[PDB]
Amino acid sequence: AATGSRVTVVLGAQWGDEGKGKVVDLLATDADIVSRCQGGNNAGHTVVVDGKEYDFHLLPSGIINTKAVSFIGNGVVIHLPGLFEEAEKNEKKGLKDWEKRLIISDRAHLVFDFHQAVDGLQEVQRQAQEGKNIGTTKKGIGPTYSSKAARTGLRICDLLSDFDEFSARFKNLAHQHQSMFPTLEIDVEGQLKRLKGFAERIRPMVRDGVYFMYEALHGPPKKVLVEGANAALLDIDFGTYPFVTSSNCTVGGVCTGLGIPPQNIGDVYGVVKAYTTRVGIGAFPTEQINEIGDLLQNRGHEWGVTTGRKRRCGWLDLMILRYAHMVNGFTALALTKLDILDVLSEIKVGISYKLNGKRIPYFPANQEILQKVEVEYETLPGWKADTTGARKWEDLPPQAQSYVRFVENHMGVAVKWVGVGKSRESMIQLF
Amino acid sequence: AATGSRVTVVLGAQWGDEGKGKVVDLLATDADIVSRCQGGNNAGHTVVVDGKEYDFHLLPSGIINTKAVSFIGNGVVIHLPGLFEEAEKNEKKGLKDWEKRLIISDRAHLVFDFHQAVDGLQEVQRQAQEGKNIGTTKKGIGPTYSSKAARTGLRICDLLSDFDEFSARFKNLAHQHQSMFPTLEIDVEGQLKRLKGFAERIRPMVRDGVYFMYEALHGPPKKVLVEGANAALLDIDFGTYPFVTSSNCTVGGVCTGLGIPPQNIGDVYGVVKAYTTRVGIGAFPTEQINEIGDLLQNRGHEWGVTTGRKRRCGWLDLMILRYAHMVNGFTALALTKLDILDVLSEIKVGISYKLNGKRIPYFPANQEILQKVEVEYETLPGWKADTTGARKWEDLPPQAQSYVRFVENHMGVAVKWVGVGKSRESMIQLF
Numbered sequence: 001a002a003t004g005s006r007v008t009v010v011l012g013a014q015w016g017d018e019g020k021g022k023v024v025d026l027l028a029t030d031a032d033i034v035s036r037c038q039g040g041n042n043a044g045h046t047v048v049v050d051g052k053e054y055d056f057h058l059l060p061s062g063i064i065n066t067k068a069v070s071f072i073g074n075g076v077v078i079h080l081p082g083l084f085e086e087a088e089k090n091e092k093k094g095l096k097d098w099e100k101r102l103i104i105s106d107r108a109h110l111v112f113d114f115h116q117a118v119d120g121l122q123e124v125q126r127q128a129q130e131g132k133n134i135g136t137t138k139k140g141i142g143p144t145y146s147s148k149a150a151r152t153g154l155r156i157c158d159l160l161s162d163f164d165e166f167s168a169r170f171k172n173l174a175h176q177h178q179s180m181f182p183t184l185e186i187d188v189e190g191q192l193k194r195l196k197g198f199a200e201r202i203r204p205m206v207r208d209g210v211y212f213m214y215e216a217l218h219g220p221p222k223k224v225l226v227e228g229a230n231a232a233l234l235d236i237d238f239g240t241y242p243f244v245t246s247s248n249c250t251v252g253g254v255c256t257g258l259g260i261p262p263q264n265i266g267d268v269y270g271v272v273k274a275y276t277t278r279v280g281i282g283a284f285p286t287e288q289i290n291e292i293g294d295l296l297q298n299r300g301h302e303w304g305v306t307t308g309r310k311r312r313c314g315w316l317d318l319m320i321l322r323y324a325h326m327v328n329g330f331t332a333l334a335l336t337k338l339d340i341l342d343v344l345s346e347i348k349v350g351i352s353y354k355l356n357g358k359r360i361p362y363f364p365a366n367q368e369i370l371q372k373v374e375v376e377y378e379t380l381p382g383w384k385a386d387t388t389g390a391r392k393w394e395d396l397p398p399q400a401q402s403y404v405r406f407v408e409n410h411m412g413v414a415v416k417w418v419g420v421g422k423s424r425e426s427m428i429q430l431f
Numbered sequence: 432a433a434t435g436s437r438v439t440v441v442l443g444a445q446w447g448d449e450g451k452g453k454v455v456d457l458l459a460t461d462a463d464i465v466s467r468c469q470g471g472n473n474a475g476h477t478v479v480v481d482g483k484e485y486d487f488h489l490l491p492s493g494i495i496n497t498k499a500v501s502f503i504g505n506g507v508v509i510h511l512p513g514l515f516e517e518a519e520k521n522e523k524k525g526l527k528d529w530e531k532r533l534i535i536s537d538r539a540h541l542v543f544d545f546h547q548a549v550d551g552l553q554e555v556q557r558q559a560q561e562g563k564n565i566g567t568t569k570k571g572i573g574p575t576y577s578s579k580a581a582r583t584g585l586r587i588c589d590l591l592s593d594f595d596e597f598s599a600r601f602k603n604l605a606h607q608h609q610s611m612f613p614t615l616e617i618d619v620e621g622q623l624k625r626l627k628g629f630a631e632r633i634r635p636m637v638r639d640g641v642y643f644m645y646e647a648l649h650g651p652p653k654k655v656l657v658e659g660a661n662a663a664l665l666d667i668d669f670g671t672y673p674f675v676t677s678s679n680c681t682v683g684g685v686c687t688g689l690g691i692p693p694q695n696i697g698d699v700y701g702v703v704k705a706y707t708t709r710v711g712i713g714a715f716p717t718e719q720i721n722e723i724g725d726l727l728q729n730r731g732h733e734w735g736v737t738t739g740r741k742r743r744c745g746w747l748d749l750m751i752l753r754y755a756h757m758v759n760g761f762t763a764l765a766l767t768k769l770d771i772l773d774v775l776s777e778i779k780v781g782i783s784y785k786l787n788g789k790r791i792p793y794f795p796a797n798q799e800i801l802q803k804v805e806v807e808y809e810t811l812p813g814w815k816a817d818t819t820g821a822r823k824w825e826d827l828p829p830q831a832q833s834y835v836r837f838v839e840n841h842m843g844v845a846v847k848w849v850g851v852g853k854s855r856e857s858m859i860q861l862f
C-alpha cells in the first residue's frame with residue numbers, strides 16, 4: 001500500500017476502433033479518474049448511453065461522468081482549436097461544466113495548425129511520388145510527434161509561461177517546416193494570436209501531471225482508469241511500421257505517457273472486435289474485399305469516427321491478437337461486436353500465416369512480408385440468432401458461446417466482457 | 432508463474448553517468464540475459480574488472496559476461512559503423528566471440544551517417560542563431576528518433592530484407608534531410624554500399640526481439656537484466672526539456688523498448704551519484720562553478736565517456752531525485768562514488784527550490800523556471816576518512832553512514848548498494 005494504488009487500463013488489441021470508448025465508458029461509471037496517455041485527436045471513441053451518443057477524440061471518454069476527473073497526460077499531443085471545438089460540440093449534447101473536471105498535464109506537446117497542414121502535404125507528397133501514402137487522419141499527429149523527438153516542439157507549460165518567448169520559438173518552428181514545404185503557408189501572427197487566447201482558456205485546467213498522478217496513486221484510495229488510443233498493431237514500435245501511428249499504443253505507453261511505474265498498473269484489458277478492421281494503408285491478412293467484407297462493413301457501420309473513411313473489414317485474426325498479447329500482457333479481454341456476426345451461417349477465423357507454403361513462427365517485423373502471407377483459417381459454425389438482447393452468459397446460444405471460448409483458448413486470455421450492442425447496457429460480464 | 436519471470440532494471444536517477452555500467456556489471460555476473468532498451472551510443476558506460484577497464488556505448492555492459500546473452504532491444508537506435516567500431520575496440524581488450532552472444536532486435540531503428548551529420552549541423556545552427564544549443568553528443572540520436580516518429584526511418588528488418596527496396600527509401604530519406612540542410616553532403620552509394628556490407632555482418636545476430644523476450648520470460652526460469660541508458664532528467668518526456676535526450680530513459684522505456692508488460696518488471700534500481708553531474712546545456716540548480724566544483728570534477732574524473740567533454744559538477748540534489756522516484760518507482764538505490772567525498776569536511780545537499788523566496792511544491796515542468804530557483808541546502812558533516820577500502824556496512828565511518836541514511840530518508844527508498852570505487856569489488860551491499 002506504501003507503493004500506491006494500481007490503475008486499470010483499456011487497450012486496443014488490433015488496428016483501432018475495437019470499442020475502447022464503449023469499454024472505457026462502462027468501466028468509468030465508478031472511476032475517480034479517467035485519463036488518456038498517448039496519441040491525439042486522430043482517435044475516435046464512441047460512447048452510447050440512454051440513446052445518447054457521443055464521439056470523443058481528445059477528451060477522455062469518461063468526461064461524461066460528472067463525478068470523475070478526466071485527465072490528459074503528457075504523452076498526448078494536443079491541438080487546442082480541435083479540443084475546444086470538440087468540447088463545444090458535446091456541450092450541445094448536454095456536456096455541462098466539463099471544464100470543471102478536466103485536468104491537462106503541463107508537459108503535453110502542442111499540435112500546431114501547420115503540423116496538420118504538413119501532415120496533409122507529406123501525404124500528397126508520398127502518394128504523388130512512390131504511389132502510396134500512409135493514410136493518416138491528417139490531424140498532424142506524425143508531424144507533432146516528430147517535433148517532440150527533435151525537441152523543437154512546444155508544450156503546454158511553454159504556452160502558459162512567458163508568451164514572448166513562446167512566440168519566438170513558435171515563429172522559428174514554423175519556419176523550419178516551411179523549409180520542408182516551401183509551398184506551406186503559415187499565418188504566424190494569425191495562429192500565434194489565437195494561441196495567446198487559448199492559453200488563458202486552458203490555463204485553469206493545466207497542472208503538473210507527474211505530481212497529480214503521483215499524489216492520486218498514493219493518497220486516499222482512488223480508481224484510476226487509463227483509456228488507450230489507437231491500438232497494438234498501430235504502435236510506432238510494434239505495429240505494421242511504417243503503417244502505424246506515431247505513438248506507443250501498447251501498455252508501455254501508459255507508463256511513459258502518464259509518468260507512473262509498472263508497479264502502479266493493475267488490470268490491462270484488451271479490447272477485441274469479433275472480426276478485424278483497418279482504416280488506412282497497410283497489410284491486412286484476413287481482409288475480405290468481397291460480399292463478406294460488405295456485410296461486415298455494413299452491419300457493423302464501419303466508417304471512421306474521425307475521418308468518415310470507410311474501414312476495411314476482415315475475419316478475426318489470431319496472429320495479430322496473440323502478438324498483441326505478447327507485448328501488452330492482457331489480464332482479460334473484451335470481445336466486442338459479437339452481434340454483428342448473428343447472421344452468418346459460418347465464421348472463418350485466421351489462426352496462422354504461411355509464406356512459402358510454410359507457416360511463420362511469429363508475427364513478421366517486416367510489413368511487406370505480411371502482404372505476401374497466405375493465412376489459414378478455422379471455419380466455425382454461426383449461431384444465426386439475435387444476441388443483441390443477451391445480458392448473461394446463458395442468454396447466448398451454443399455456437400455463440402463456442403466462439404467466445406475459441407478466442408479464450410487460442411489466446412490464453414479470459415474474455416471478461418462480451419459486447420452485443422453499442423449502448424452501455426449491451427454488455428455481458430462473464431466474471 | 433504462468434505470466435512469466437520479471438526482469439531486473441538499472442536506471443539513472445539524475446542526468447546520466449551515475450555509474451549504471453558499474454551497477455549493471457555487478458548484477459550481470461549471474462544473469463542469463465542483459466539488454467539495452469533505449470537510446471544509442473550517446474551513452475558511455477564504464478566497467479572495471481580485474482584492473483581491466485571497458486567503455487561501452489551500444490553493446491550492453493554485460494557483454495563481457497561470456498555465459499550471458501547481450502540483447503539490443505527495438506527501442507534502441509543503432510549506428511552500425513559505430514557498433515562494430517566499438518565491438519572491435521573491445522576485441523583488442525580481450526572481448527572474444529562477442530558476436531556469438533549478441534542478439535539484435537529486428538525492429539531497432541538505424542542511425543545513418545547523415546543523421547549524425549545533421550546532428551552536428553542543427554547544433555551549429557541553434558548556436559549560431561539563438562545563442563545556445565542543446566549540447567548533444569552529436570551522435571545523430573535526436574535526428575534518428577525524429578525519423579522514427581515521422582516513420583521515415585529504416586529498421587534492421589528493412590536492411591536485411593530486399594536491399595533494392597531499402598536503397599530506394601535510403602536515398603529518399605537522405606534527400607529529405609538535404610532539404611533541411613542543403614549544405615549537407617551525402618555520399619549515397621558510398622554509405623549505401625557500406626550498409627549493404629553491414630547487413631551480412633549483423634544478419635546472423637538479428638532476431639525477432641518480441642518473440643525472443645517473450646519466450647525468455649515464459650520458458651524455463653532465467654535472469655534478465657535491463658541496462659538503462661542516460662537518465663531520468665534527460666527523459667524526452669520528463670527531463671529538462673528541451674535539454675534532454677530523445678528517448679524515454681525512465682522505466683516505461685523498458686516496456687516500450689523491449690516489448691514486455693509491466694507485469695514482467697521486477698526490481699527497478701535507481702543509480703544515484705553522491706553528488707550531481709550534467710554534461711551539456713541546461714539548468715543545473717546545485718551546480719558548483721567554483722573550487723568545490725573543481726574538486727568534484729577532478730577527484731571524480733568527470734569527463735564524458737562518449738565525448739571527452741568535461742562534465743559540470745554540483746552537490747547532490749534531492750528535488751530531481753524525488754521527482755525521478757515519482758516516475759520510476761525505484762525499489763532500491765545504488766549510491767555511487769561515495770569515496771569522492773572522503774576528503775570534504777562538510778557536504779551540502781540540496782533539499783528544495785525557492786523561486787520568489789517561496790518554495791516550489793514540485794519539480795518545474797518549465798526548465799527556465801529551474802534556472803531561476805534558489806536551492807536551499809542541508810550541510811552535512813564529512814567523514815574525512817578513506818572509504819575506498821570498505822566492503823561492509825560497518826567499515827564505513829559514522830558520518831559516511833549518516834550520509835547514506837540522509838539519502839534513504841529524504842527519498843523514502845532504501846540504498847541497497849554503496850560504491851567506493853570504479854572496480855566491481857568496490858561495492859558494499861547493504862542487504
Ligand SMILES: Nc1nc2c(ncn2[C@@H]2O[C@H](COP(=O)(O)OP(=O)(O)O)[C@@H](O)[C@H]2O)c(=O)[nH]1
Nearest residue numbers: 017018019020021044045046337419420421422
Ligand atoms: N453492434 C455493436 N456495435 C458496437 C459494439 N461495441 C462497440 N460498437 C460500435 O462499434 C464502433 C467502434 O468504433 P470506435 O468507437 O472508433 O471504437 P474505439 O476507437 O476503439 O473507441 C462504434 O460505433 C461503437 O458504437 C458491440 O458490441 N456491438
Ligand SMILES: Nc1nc2c(ncn2[C@@H]2O[C@H](COP(=O)(O)OP(=O)(O)O)[C@@H](O)[C@H]2O)c(=O)[nH]1
Nearest residue numbers: 448449450451452475476477768850851852853
Ligand atoms: N571512485 C569511484 N568511481 C566510480 C564509482 N562508481 C562509478 N565510478 C566511475 O564513475 C564514472 C561514471 O561514468 P559513466 O561510466 O559514464 O556512468 P554511466 O554512464 O551511468 O554508466 C566511471 O568512470 C566509473 O568508473 C564509485 O563508487 N567510485
Ligand SMILES: O=P(O)(O)OC[C@H]1O[C@@H](n2cnc3c(OP(=O)(O)O)ncnc32)[C@H](O)[C@@H]1O
Nearest residue numbers: 016017042043044136137229230244245279280
Ligand atoms: O498518423 P495518424 O493520423 O495516427 O495515422 C496513422 C495510421 O493510424 C491509423 N489510426 C490512427 N488512429 C486510429 C484510431 O484510433 P482509435 O482506435 O483510438 O479510434 N483508430 C483506427 N485507426 C487509427 C490511421 O488510419 C493511419 O493508417
Ligand SMILES: O=P(O)(O)OC[C@H]1O[C@@H](n2cnc3c(OP(=O)(O)O)ncnc32)[C@H](O)[C@@H]1O
Nearest residue numbers: 447448473474475567568660661675676710711
Ligand atoms: O541528443 P543526445 O546526444 O542524447 O544529447 C542530448 C543531451 O543528453 C546528454 N546525454 C546523452 N546521453 C548521455 C549520457 O548517457 P549515459 O548516462 O548512458 O552515459 N550521460 C550523460 N549525458 C548524456 C547530452 O550531453 C545532451 O545534453
Ligand SMILES: O=CN(O)CC(=O)O
Nearest residue numbers: 043044304305306307
Ligand atoms: O475512430 C477513429 N478512427 O477510426 C479514425 C478515422 O476515422 O480515420
Ligand SMILES: O=CN(O)CC(=O)O
Nearest residue numbers: 474475735736737738
Ligand atoms: O558517458 C557518456 N556521456 O557522459 C556522454 C558524453 O560523453 O557526452
Ligand SMILES: [Mg+2]
Nearest residue numbers: 017044045305
Ligand atoms: Mg475509433
Ligand SMILES: [Mg+2]
Nearest residue numbers: 448475476736
Ligand atoms: Mg556515461
